[PDB]
């Protein structure tokens, strides 16, 4: 039960290795296309750059832009953490069909981006948005 | 039993003397024996060179410093215990 919607986890395998993601929906029972206990997540690919009080507003926006990604990941490849992210506006947007039709996948990516942008500006989940160094 | 007494030393044949070959026998069975890895428990530790003991366990791959012929020596074990008791006292 420690893999719940709203829980921050780390992707340990795949292209996005070491990226912090939020559990968007858990299908631990399995599925026909994914016979294992997978969980769809939304995370960050390009973390926003560090900002300085001396920086002008245009660069502050320029560095604060964040590139998200949505992915279904195996439980064994996810590393759950104690941190939790409040996924407001992000409760119902992901479904098996949303992955089947990429137009819903593209819409989900855009909504995930705008939510991550606003949350970053709000200054919440500082650990979630800082890159993990390894 | 192919050889009743000589053992691994049968390769040396009749040369070098009986006593000068028996001590090699004890040292050589120690040197070529397989030892249980302290980190993975698998019986996969084998001598590489004099003092080097490498574990070929997939996922362990740990190298160790030890005796020339055996992984752990009495002198090293005594030193480890005395240093442990000194540190605990200190």
């Amino acid at each position: 039960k420690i893999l719940k919607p709203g829980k921050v986890a780390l992707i340990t395998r795949g292209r996005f290795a070491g990226k912090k993601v939020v559990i968007l929906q858990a299908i631990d029972q399995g599925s026909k296309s994914h016979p294992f206990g997978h969980a769809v997540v939304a995370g960050v690919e390009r973390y926003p750059l560090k900002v300085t009080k001396s920086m002008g507003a245009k660069r502050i926006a320029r560095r604060s832009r964040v590139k998200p990604f949505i992915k279904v990941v195996n439980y064994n490849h996810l590393m759950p953490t104690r941190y939790a992210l409040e996924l407001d506006n992000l409760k119902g947007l992901i479904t098996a069909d949303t992955f089947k039709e990429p137009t819903q996948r593209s819409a989900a990516r855009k909504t995930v981006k705008k939510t991550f942008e606003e949350k970053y500006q709000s200054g919440k989940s500082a650990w979630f948005f800082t890159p993990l160094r390894f | 039993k192919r050889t009743k007494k000589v053992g691994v030393t049968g390769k040396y044949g009749v040369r070098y003397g009986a006593s000068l070959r028996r001590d090699v026998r004890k040292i050589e069975v120690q040197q070529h024996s397989r030892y249980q890895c302290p980190f993975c428990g698998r019986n996969t530790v084998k001598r590489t060179a004099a003092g080097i003991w490498c574990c070929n366990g997939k996922g362990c791959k740990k190298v160790l410093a030890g005796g020339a012929w055996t992984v752990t020596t009495a002198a090293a074990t005594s030193a480890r215990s005395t240093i442990r008791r000194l540190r605990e006292m200190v």
Binding site: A17, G18, M79, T81, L132, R133 | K61
Partner: protein, 106 residues
């Protein structure tokens, strides 16, 4: 029939590596070939890396970028298992230094 070295180097060495061909003129001939390449090895575990060809050092310069690496963090420098250990050990020790700091701050 018998063959001779094409170059002026006798004394088969590592650089004097040869192959037998039969030509369109029905001739048994040596072909002087180069040494074989090596798959890049992992930096931490030393295992050869997966997804990269086995080429000589300079012959790596002709490849495309994606043909010499793997799309992952440290990809093309560390194996997948090595990277996974890097990630989990990094996160776990970071949580410790946080919990040690919270312990010592009070």
């Amino acid at each position: 029939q018998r063959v001779t070295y094409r170059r002026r180097l006798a004394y088969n060495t590592r650089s004097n590596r040869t192959r037998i061909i039969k030509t369109p003129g029905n001739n048994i001939r040596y072909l002087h070939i180069k040494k074989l390449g090596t798959i890049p090895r992992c930096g931490d575990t030393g295992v050869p890396l997966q997804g990269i060809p086995a080429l000589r050092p300079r012959e790596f310069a002709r490849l495309s970028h994606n043909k010499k690496t793997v799309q992952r963090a440290y990809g093309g420098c560390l194996s997948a298992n090595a990277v996974k250990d890097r990630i989990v050990r990094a996160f776990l020790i970071e949580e410790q230094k946080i919990v040690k700091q919270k312990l010592k701050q009070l």
